[PDB]
């Protein structure tokens, strides 16, 4: 049923980019802060270079489809892969998201985050996920930890390691066993390993709840060994303090057992953007009307969202 994926995968030279700094390091290798300078194009692009140490051919093999997936997507609210570099240790180059993880940002700036931003972030994630649904794609790991902050007003969806494409006939994806983020998953995902766009809506609901609680742990202090029994018994995450019943009504609908009864991402865009126009009415935060939120040379620097191929 499907159209040809004529997306372009760009192979980069190691001499094409400069490494300024190390953001983080792990057994999975080290992420570098750097600038990408296309040979003779007079442009410097702030990048995140994530490239790994002890490679197993299994590790290599599909660090690569994450790259396959990211190269295929093109949306203002989705992290686009800039290119890869086939060194001794394979190089993956993405757009730099300076403020980093959204989960860490709301924990760090919980004192200076207004209702306007929170509602905006909800819309943008909803837009990004809606683009993913159009591309017949299921993320399978949507969480606040996997939304990156370009600017406080611009966020993008990331971590496509578990993402899967759906065939034209396909409506559900049936997975295989492995370690999974239980407390973000839909009930059918936990029980029958079944995933869908609606299973992302569930996960989308939890992500919002995280933001509204400024980074609280979902079902904190309760063992994951039977989150799914509790979900069957009818219990859900509590209503965040700042949340009007309006906003919390929306989260609850995402946690419906009948996946078809859950809101589509295109509708979540509408409702949250409806509330985004009158923020104070839908999110009660103290000192809300007074809050404001906002590295190496910088003459030829262009952001990746402005550099088109």
């Amino acid at each position: 049923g499907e159209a040809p994926n004529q997306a372009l995968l760009r192979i980069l030279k190691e001499t094409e980019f400069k490494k300024i700094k190390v953001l983080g390091s792990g057994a999975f290798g080290t992420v570098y802060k750097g600038l990408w300078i296309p040979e003779g194009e007079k442009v410097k692009i702030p990048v995140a270079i994530k490239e790994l140490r002890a490679t197993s051919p299994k590790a290599n093999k599909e660090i690569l489809d994450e790259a396959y997936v990211m190269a295929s997507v093109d949306n203002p609210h989705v992290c686009r892969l800039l290119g890869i570099c086939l060194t001794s240790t394979v190089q993956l180059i993405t757009q730099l998201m300076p403020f980093g993880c959204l989960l860490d940002y709301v924990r760090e700036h919980k004192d200076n985050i207004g209702s306007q931003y929170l509602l905006n972030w909800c819309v943008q994630i909803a837009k990004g996920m809606n683009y993913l649904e159009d591309r017949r794609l299921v993320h399978r790991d949507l969480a606040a930890r996997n939304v990156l902050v370009k600017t406080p007003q611009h966020v993008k969806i990331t971590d496509f390691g578990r993402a899967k494409l759906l065939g034209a006939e396909e409506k559900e994806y049936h997975a295989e066993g492995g370690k999974v983020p239980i407390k973000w998953m839909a009930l059918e995902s936990i029980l029958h390993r079944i995933y869908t766009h609606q299973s992302d809506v569930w996960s989308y609901g939890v992500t919002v709840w995280e933001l509204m609680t400024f980074g609280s742990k979902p079902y904190d202090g309760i063992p994951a060994s039977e989150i799914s029994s509790i979900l069957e018994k009818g219990e859900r995450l509590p209503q965040p303090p700042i949340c009007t019943i309006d906003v919390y009504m929306i989260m609850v609908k995402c946690w419906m057992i009948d996946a078809d009864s859950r809101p589509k991402f295109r509708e979540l865009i509408i409702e949250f953007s409806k509330m985004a126009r009158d923020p104070q009415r839908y999110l009660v935060i103290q000192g809300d009307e007074r809050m404001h939120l906002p590295d190496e040379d910088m003459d030829d620097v262009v952001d990746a969202d402005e550099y088109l191929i």
Partner: peptide, 7 residues
Amino acid sequence: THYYLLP
């Protein structure tokens, strides 16, 4: 510490 064993 939030990736779990699925039965």
